[PDB]
Symmetry: D2
Subunit: 364 residues, 4 copies
């Protein structure tokens, strides 16, 4: 991309951790350039924030509607917008952006219902604009390594996919942890095993902090994949003592792979009957696709900020290919798009249906 994509944010204002990483990622390597935004419901502190960031005073709109309409009149108007507002606003804001002919990057989750998600998807195709979803963990290079090893048959036939995102920060929309954290490792499995398809699943959710009912702060999701493989997802915000605990273990007939988000730069490779191995980010034995995004030599620890930059970069590549109508270039870019968004919403929906019905199996 010869030039930075004219960008803007909705939300992600003062003291927003989420907004900060979005900006770091998007502006990394000047892939995007923040030229406008609706940073706060509070108009005064919205412009005060936008200006410290160097955003022109007249482009620190009071809301997303005014921003979209006014920007449409500028030859230098925004081309894409990132949404970091509350979950219940995601559907309406993403809908507007698309109708405005803008590329979108929406913070998880896309929306609350499958219907809404399918509506947004029809619009993205109608307006020919991408809708990326922030499954930022997929930006870590080793996730690519796993994908390549599995496709190359290094694990043999896949038998199980054990996932979990269980932290304890809350030991003291249709769901809470299922949508807030469960979907992250679920998307990682999508990247690692793109051909695996869910046939049916059951879920058991609890509200250990009672006042949270009906929203769950803990959940178990058991899945049956077409072909015989099994899947398990443990979602939690009450796993006391856990700093994050997002892990995915893929088990095959020949070996297993295991990745942990708190140790992003190492990937466990366990061949049955052989010594366990630890693969390191940036090493020459890695598949080429797992090396392209390295920003520093192996041994030097990269982090989540790098992963998000890698993710935002792919978003940029997708938008660009979509704009130049370069069918070939778009097919070569893998990113969390509208389909991943739809699936995230559907998985949660199926899980809630099962859980509300005493954990019955439900077709996917």
């Amino acid at each position: 991309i010869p030039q930075p994509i004219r960008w803007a944010m909705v939300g992600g204002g003062s003291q927003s951790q989420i907004g900060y990483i979005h900006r770091c990622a998007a502006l990394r390597d000047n892939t995007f350039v923040l030229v406008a935004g609706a940073f706060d419901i509070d108009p005064i502190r919205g412009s005060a924030f936008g200006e410290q960031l160097g955003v022109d005073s007249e482009r620190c709109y009071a809301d997303y509607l005014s921003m979209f309409e006014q920007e449409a009149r500028r030859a230098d108007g925004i081309q894409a917008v990132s949404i970091a507002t509350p979950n219940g606003t995601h559907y309406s804001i993403t809908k507007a952006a698309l109708e405005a002919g803008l590329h979108v990057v929406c913070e998880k989750p896309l929306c609350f219902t499958v219907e809404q998600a399918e509506n947004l998807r029809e619009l993205s195709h109608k307006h020919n604009r991408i809708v990326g979803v922030t499954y930022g963990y997929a930006g870590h290079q080793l996730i690519e390594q796993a994908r390549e090893m599995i496709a190359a048959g290094e694990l043999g036939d896949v038998r199980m996919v054990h996932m979990q995102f269980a932290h304890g920060f809350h030991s003291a929309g249709p769901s809470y942890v299922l949508g807030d954290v469960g979907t992250h490792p679920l998307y990682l499995s999508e990247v690692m095993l793109p051909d695996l398809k869910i046939k049916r699943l059951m879920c058991s959710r609890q509200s250990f902090v009672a006042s949270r009912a009906p929203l769950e702060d803990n959940a178990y999701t058991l899945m049956e994949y077409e072909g015989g493989a099994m899947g398990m997802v443990w979602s939690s915000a009450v796993n006391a003592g856990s700093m994050h605990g997002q892990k995915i273990r893929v088990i095959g007939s020949r070996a297993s792979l295991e990745w942990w988000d708190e140790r992003p730069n190492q990937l466990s490779f366990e061949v049955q009957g052989q010594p366990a191995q630890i693969l390191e980010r940036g090493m020459g034995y890695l598949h080429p696709n797992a090396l392209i995004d390295d920003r520093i030599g192996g041994g030097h620890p990269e982090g989540l900020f790098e992963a998000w930059a890698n993710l935002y970069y792919r978003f940029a590549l997708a938008m660009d290919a979509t704009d130049r109508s370069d069918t070939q270039a778009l097919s070569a870019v893998r990113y969390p798009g509208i389909d991943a968004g739809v699936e995230g919403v559907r998985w949660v929906e199926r899980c809630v249906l099962s859980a509300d019905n005493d954990s019955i199996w439900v077709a996917y």
Copy 2:
């Protein structure tokens, strides 16, 4: 001191070809808690006698079968007082029954038997003949398991919310069940030790035979449980967890903190208070509870292993036998060991999981009768 005279002991099976006879002997004979004076070591008379004589066992006490041993030993004044059964799982029920009927304390290699009805029969006989029936859930012999029990009882974890268990190795990546009873019940007993008051209300199980030829016996299973009171429990049993050397772990999650133990690192115990720095407790340290230090056989820092745990277990079996022989109920209750009750529950747990699994993972009441329609 407490076992002044070594308990006259015998073994059924565990001969030359046995893969478990060694740990049983090392554990039982340690500190001379038991003394091997007889046995029915082999289905092959000559090989059994050869083996037995190599152990210093009276040639005339190397019986051809468990029945002849029980019958003849019962006529001797210095006849065996206890017997350890290490024969194939299918024989555990009948041998344990014969031993009990013969007035012998029993130590049975898990499982105790295959059905709950058989299990209840052994329990009935055990009470009738006033003889114990220890079951070999030997991982419970590790000191830190007691530490966890003490910590949980002291409210260190606040209210218990989840008990996550697993015993998933991958050696087989290439009765009524396989992994559920072979490995699943080990961590299950560990939870019993750490949380004696927790009662299972109902559970569901999903089991698979990844190596198809094994069906209907499962080489992988997931068990989700609901404890009375709201807590949840999960058990992952597997012999196809490729790359895993054992993988037996248990994590107890409470409202205030969690604790986790892994059998491959038996001398450490993770203690994670939410909002505080994670902690690692070490076997043999002064900050441990006395009940978690009494079994130490060497100073902290030096690693102890499964053999020590098994010796610790057999020692409790001996204490239980002595208290029972003394008709001391209160004393007996002070001995924390996997006895007839744990044996029954281990069989029940497998039976309920199998019932759930055979019925597409529907919820089944842990106790009581489950019905399709009623």
Copy 3:
């Protein structure tokens, strides 16, 4: 700092070193890149600089030309970072200072103590700062260690064991001593500022023979005033090691240990108590260790964050020096740190070249 500092880069063109420098300086718009001498090849330099959005007339052919022409601009650079070969650090830093520009020089300030003394002379004379890239000190937990040690949580310090031994090369006056040994040495400086080296000895080897007389491995034993002992293992031939930079501070009451490959955790081991692991971003950390958090605990930050934090401190020192006032409340690897880094290497080489005899530190 209301306005970004007008910044330039010498070298670090089409260079991961240049990359992390830029990522760090430009983050949160602490600095703004307006000029540079990116390459020996003007064509490649201009192309590079232009890709970065730098005016073509400000993509200078050499550092002197840049310093000369920029002095004539109201929007001229105020600071310059050097990422050229270690052999050019001295002369370029000297030129920068005489030009009245703040400087950020890559790891080795220079080769000799004389040179280091001269640069310090100039920094004071032109009242400009000279930061050195001991970036690992940017990690928050290093601050945590410093505070814990100062509050006496380790009791009396007895030993300081450091190492930076990787194996990438298993197949100036030194090599690893200056390239990797000085990194954990600076970490100890931040953790134990009051510690003073009395004397030390060093043993160095050239396992890959052709590297002689430069060492690819070295052991440095030190005696601190007060009785504490210090050990430094520098290596590029520790086969199998991805980096292996670690520091363990041992006190009479407890120890703490940090490893650069797991920057977000700090081991705290109180004798007779359960070992503890401190996590970046947690509420039990000292306030000073939390100020630089850019994201919640549990999310792994990395070396890029540490460098960002380092560059912010450089900016703060430059500002305070400019507004002339504040400079005392900002800790950072400056000229003194640079000088000491040079002296430690010089003392180590002297000892090693003389069969590991003890040598007074100063």
Copy 4:
């Protein structure tokens, strides 16, 4: 099979008040390699007799002192054949000497003695009376130490460049030395097993007494060594490494790869080939060398501990004794155990480090005479 009849054994010390007597007995009596038939267990005859009797030792063979035992036992047809000395370090020399002169094989708790001259005397006596002198560098009993030896000999590490050793615990944070001989020599013997052909050319040592009252005995020390051939070696000995439970580690660094072992995790061995994924080898796996599998007492995955290592050690002492009794030199050379030579070298290393440390860390020749001026 190779020890048809249990070796008539005895202990000097290791009584009820000893904290090392238990591991010696467990190791020696395991598999009936040895049989305890006599002892000089306590300087207090009454307590020694009581103790000994509790072990099945005839009251008449519970001697009041090692001298009496050696003299009386030598006059018995069923007299002891070997003796383990577990008394204070200062007595090792004289007791070992007396045992050897009394025609007894010896197993001495380290160190063998305090001076090289004494160590050479014991070596001379050992050859004269043709009796072995094993030294308890028990950590070498762990299987993975043999694996490392095999890997190094097979060239897995390429050319050895560095040998980094340490044994630094913090239990004491609050003869001629303390930690050098007490813990320093353990990993040193581990390196001897892994790198038998490596020869020390010269070394320097810096030692400190952080708890001043201990001086001149050190509670911390650093030893830097130059091996013949160019490789370097480092040993950190410490009793004041606050927070460390044991901390015994050895990392061997070669031109191609490195390997590392930690006594607190004895069942794993790190294998790091430069440029390749780090590897972790596990005790009991089929990819190990048979010499590293032969001592397995249970399947991999189950953790073995220091007691197994010690039993493995004692078994080798037994094999060495038998080979010596058969006068089979070639057979004796196949038995890899810490014998008199390892004993002498353990004493020499300490003596050289002390000489250097006492002289402000000057380089001292490992072999030969060191001089201020010459």
